[PDB]
Design a protein around this nucleic acid. Sequence first.
RNA 1: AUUGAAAGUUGUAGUAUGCGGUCCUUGCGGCUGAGAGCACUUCAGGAGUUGCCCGCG
Length: 67
Amino acid sequence: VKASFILPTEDFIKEVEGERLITAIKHNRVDVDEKGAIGSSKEGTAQMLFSREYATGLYGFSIVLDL
RNA sequence: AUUGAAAGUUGUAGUAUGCGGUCCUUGCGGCUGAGAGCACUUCAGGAGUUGCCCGCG
């Protein structure tokens, strides 16, 4: 089984050319204290703030099966 | 079947929690659509005319 890379189609890129089409979003993992506190790490970060990037577009694929 | 062959950059994670666009406020006071004004002035229902005609309780 041969699998190629997943690339967005070239006409879509040519038409769009601009715009990031990549959105960076922040998620927080909550670790509260024993009774009700958010912990001694302060609320500058809730407990932690990590970041994730999400893409968007029309992609092309090609798969070969030599069964 | 190519220095290629086997291969997750993988798994778990809430920007969340409480926070009144709030309390007081006259569209308010005074103000003649009023005073003057002939549906008035001239005017015949008017001029002609046999209850008509015959009569033995």
